[PDB]
Amino acid sequence: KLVRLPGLIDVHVHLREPGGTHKEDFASGTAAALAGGITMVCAMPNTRPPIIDAPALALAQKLAEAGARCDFALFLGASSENAGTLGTVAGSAAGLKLYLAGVTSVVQWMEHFETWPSHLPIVAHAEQQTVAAVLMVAQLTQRSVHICHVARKEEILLIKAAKARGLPVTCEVAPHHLFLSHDDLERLGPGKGEVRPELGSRQDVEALWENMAVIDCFASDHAPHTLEEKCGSRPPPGFPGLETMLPLLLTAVSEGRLSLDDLLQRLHHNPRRIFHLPPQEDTYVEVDLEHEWTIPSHMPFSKAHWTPFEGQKVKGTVRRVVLRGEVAYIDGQVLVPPGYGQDVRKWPQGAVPQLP
Amino acid sequence: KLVRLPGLIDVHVHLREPGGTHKEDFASGTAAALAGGITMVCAMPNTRPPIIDAPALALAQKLAEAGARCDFALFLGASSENAGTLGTVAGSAAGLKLYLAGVTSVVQWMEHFETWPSHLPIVAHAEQQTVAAVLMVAQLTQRSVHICHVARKEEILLIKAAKARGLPVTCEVAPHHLFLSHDDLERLGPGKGEVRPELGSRQDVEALWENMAVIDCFASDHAPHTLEEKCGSRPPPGFPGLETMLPLLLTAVSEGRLSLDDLLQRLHHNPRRIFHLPPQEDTYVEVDLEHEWTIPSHMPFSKAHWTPFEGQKVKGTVRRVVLRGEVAYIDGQVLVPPGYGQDVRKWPQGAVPQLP
Ligand SMILES: O=C(O)c1[nH]c(=O)[nH]c(=O)c1F
Ligand SMILES: O=C(O)c1[nH]c(=O)[nH]c(=O)c1F
Ligand SMILES: [Zn+2]
Ligand SMILES: [Zn+2]
Ligand SMILES: [Zn+2]
Ligand SMILES: [Zn+2]
């Protein structure tokens, strides 16, 4: 009755440690990951302190090693001051994040593309015409780029045109941009519904599904904020998503909107090959595709303690997760302690191959 | 000085056992694989008896388990009589091979696409307009197809157009169609130079390199025949290629014709994800990128005992291979016995996931 899947990978999560641990920490965020069928996460660098230099990465690595329950890699963040300074630590990171929603000039983007090691990943938060701009910088520096959370018809059609020209670009799409739209903003409210990229029109959502062939990865963009923060005076953008991503997508699979293989390419194989992430021995996920349930007002594990998918009916649930030979999750209970997770870039097979 | 690569995968080899063991057998073919940096092979079904029914697959599986030195999966072959009969064994195979260079009617192709389990791979030997025809059958049956050894400008541009339309098609290219051309037919002779698909023009070769973005996999199409056979009265088509594929491509990498990552996508990640092949624990390849050498008249291991690349200068050599924790190859010597290799489809992680 159960379907065995490989260990799924979420390449875009915000785990808020250090500095935002009331929103989430490594222990709670990776508990949410395991409950969502995710055995490896790549954690973004916009923490406090931000992971924009070697001392902050060293701190974050130790906090993750001590708190993570699943395996992980940590992104470095591009800043206005660190281009050309990350060479000694660059290989220890998941990749370099460019946040193009602190850099402010395309010249600084160029400097990062020129100085970051050319064999290591660069991901960009780039919306609307910024996608076109960062692709231009990638071409000028003759390297690849990965575009985070594509959310608009405009963006996916541009990427589609770039791929037709043979340019090295890959992209990811988050669940809220496939299963939520403007039609949900009345229910969510302007605080809760705040996210970046913002929710799209029905035409945007329909374009993403129609152009699934162009989407390389799914990633949650897990961006936990407390309900107090989301409903407060200055709502931060972001949705929690680790615990709901796979149930939403399994529903789509059971409805024939994409195949099981389509899903595993986008949550396992393509994340592995874009970010050069290693396999996980003795690691798998067992899901039940027949159980119908309704998403509640908060999932059990994220400290966000709310979800924008409340009330949606899903079909599919994570029943069991085994991580490196140990039972890590069964039916609502996480069973590996904080600290069980490891930094995959420290594994011999987790280093990115490069010419000597 | 050495570069560590993951275990490379060759998804298109002819190992001639059963029935053609003077040309190659599992023990000699997988020795050649290991010497070429290849730790997993998918073996084609045109043996004697051909692998077109359950009894012949059962025989071939035992011969491979007893003779293989690296890991493997075995293809089933589509015939004029076996459509709708392979359901019980289909999951144990690498995939289904359609040989469209014994079926003779597009109606038989349709029957195979309709009856073979829709989650399992289908590969086709399809040249020139046959690529277009089999893509049409794939669309009519709304599933994917993988096109073997693309060799012509015509073929890669057609596939490129199909991918631009979002169709689920992948393809592989063999080394002789990237590094040999019509210009080599004078040296090779009409016997030795016989191969299917035939060698292309310089314009064909140039088109394949220009459209590298369209190529998902490299695979040797290792097709060993003895020199006596290649030079005899009725030369069979085919080149041996396992021992020369990686040295040729490493040369191209050192020349900047493609990157190391480009190579590993095409000899590791994409083969894994198209054929749902499992990772290999404690498995890696160490190559030396600085050693210049000239390809001799025969490589040490293949029973073919000849090579069409004789006299080409290459830069790059396989120094060491570790397979599942054991030293399998060092500097000209294979050190795992026949029988060390295993059928990856029998591993729990090697089954193709499917809906219950
Ligand atoms: O960190 C966050 O909360 C966050 N939330 C968002 O909605 N978009 C972002 O780009 C981001 F960095
Ligand atoms: O098995 C062979 O020898 C062989 N040799 C080739 O050159 N093309 C084929 O398609 C083939 F099946
Ligand atoms: Zn972002
Ligand atoms: Zn983000
Ligand atoms: Zn063929
Ligand atoms: Zn072949």
UniProtKB/Swiss-Prot annotation, chains A, B:
What is its induction behaviour?
A: Transcriptionally repressed following hypoxia by HIF1A.
Instruction: Please give the organism.
Output: Homo sapiens (Human)
* Superkingdom in the source lineage: Eukaryota
The UniProt record gives the binding positions of Zn(2+) 2 as 12, 148, 172
Q: Which disease shows up in the entry for this protein? A: Developmental and epileptic encephalopathy 50: A form of epileptic encephalopathy, a heterogeneous group of severe early-onset epilepsies characterized by refractory seizures, neurodevelopmental impairment, and poor prognosis. Development is normal prior to seizure onset, after which cognitive and motor delays become apparent. DEE50 is an autosomal recessive, progressive disease with onset in infancy and favorable response to treatment with oral uridine.
The entry's other comment says: GATase (glutamine amidotransferase) and CPSase (carbamoyl phosphate synthase) form together the glutamine-dependent CPSase (GD-CPSase) (EC 6.3.5.5).
Q: Which residue intervals make up region (DHOase (dihydroorotase))?
A: 1-323
What protein does this entry describe? Multifunctional protein CAD
Binding locations of Zn(2+) 1: 12, 14, 97, 221
* Upper lineage: Eukaryota, Metazoa, Chordata, Craniata, Vertebrata
Please report the PTM annotation for this entry.
Answer: Activated by MAP kinase (Erk1/2) phosphorylation just prior to the S phase of the cell cycle, when the demand for pyrimidine nucleotides is greatest, and down-regulated as the cells emerge from S phase by protein kinase A (PKA) phosphorylation.
Modified positions (N6-carboxylysine) in chain numbering:
97
